[PDB]
Amino acid sequence: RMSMVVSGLTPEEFMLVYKFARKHHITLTNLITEETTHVVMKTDAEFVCERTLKYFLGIAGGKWVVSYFWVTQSIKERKMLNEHDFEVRGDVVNGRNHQGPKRARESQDRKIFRGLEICCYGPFTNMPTDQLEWMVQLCGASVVKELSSFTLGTGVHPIVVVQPDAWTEDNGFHAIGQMCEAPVVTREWVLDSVALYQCQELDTYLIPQIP
Template sequence: MSFTPEDLFNNAQIFVSKLNQREISEEDKENIISLKTVSSQKTTCTLDIMTDDSITDNNYLVASPCVSIKRETKPLVLITSGLAATESEVIHKFLGFFNATLLPKYSDDVTHVIVKTDENLKCERTLKYFLGVAGKKWVMSMEWARSCLSAMKIIDEEYFEVRGDTLTETDTLAPKISRLSGSHLRLNSTLSVERENLLSRFQICCFGNFTVDLPCDDLKRLIALCGARLVNSPSFFKLNGLKNTQNMVKCDGKKIAVIVAQTEANPQLDVNRYNDFYRRYNAFPVAREWIFDCVALYDVVPLVHYLHCQRDILKYPDLNYATKMKEE
């Protein structure tokens, strides 16, 4: 017979009530004093019936003065974004109560990204938000931390998962779609298996300077989390030896070449230079906002609205692909 953590919690309260009313014999008390591990789909709990009031260990969720439930789950590792000072105080209480860790920057160890949201569970676009989505982490409203503290247990994350960003009118559900998508396998042109992610079919070069709001290294990390192949120079695109995007996608299965550049940080780059990039490297020069929107929607959006080069110089197969961004 299996029990959920909630069943365990409720049964413990009933037992304590009977214990306090002396309706349980000493022999029964000894038999039930320490209940062993009980498993559920999301967590494993150990229930210990305590007879003194000195429960101070933050690893325990106190059900009553005599009951504690210890959770044996993966350690919680958090990063936060956009929180006010009062909200940061709540997070520090959360850290102590649930023995969680707070990191200053994103890392692969992160389990939850905590952000400030509006009433529609939408948040501002920040680097940490994008990294959380691309990294398939739980991206949570600040209200989740408050609710966990109020309930003295970890609440189901799905009720508080961020539903999108404030720049997008509709609910994109990008964090959930990314988290559940995983990285599926596909056969490449050599019939070997490789993992496919959001931008796995692209090779991307971050070219020139970038402003301090999103340094080049951070942008590259975001792109890498999305599964694209990073190259250090547009000249490496020539290694494919392919003549057009149609061949790259449909024949050889090679990766689409994209050059990401920030115009305002590179005044020396004009439309003629971007046109030359396309002609020389058969690479689409685009604004970095293309990356942001792909992650925000968790979909490969058309390149045509982000092009730095002139649209009329694109060859037909390239123009068709840049407009639709869908494979047949």
């Protein structure tokens, strides 16, 4: 059942992690599947890190999100220690307190996009849709191909996520509530909601749409 990836880290910093994996009869892949059970992260002083794609996807997969100092210290102690000891609980934008991956690995079938419907209306950067979509897919939404393809009315709240600035020949992003009836929010909504594991009330990043 045991496997994982790395993020942030240098080559040398990769190496202790090979030695560490190679030790504990483990498996190690570059990029991330649903089988991956750990994401090992670069930090500093104590347990606060950075936003890396792999970083959300270990919360969105509500998997084990151990900080690097799990390894320089499972080596500097001849055995593998505990993961609740050395877990991430922050980043450069999202806190020092929060412990995102907690309510994540803990709060499972009650999942934060509880019957939502999400459309990642393009285009975005540093993040292929597939993987942003797959992120919300993992948080419990259900991705819509195009807007017009929504399933409106009964039950489900709808939302449109777009990356602000990454719009090429733009303001083509200001005519959207003018191309349907669902809250338009920045990639920001989505990221901040996964990481914190607080399904943000969206009242705050909601690009203004033309009546």
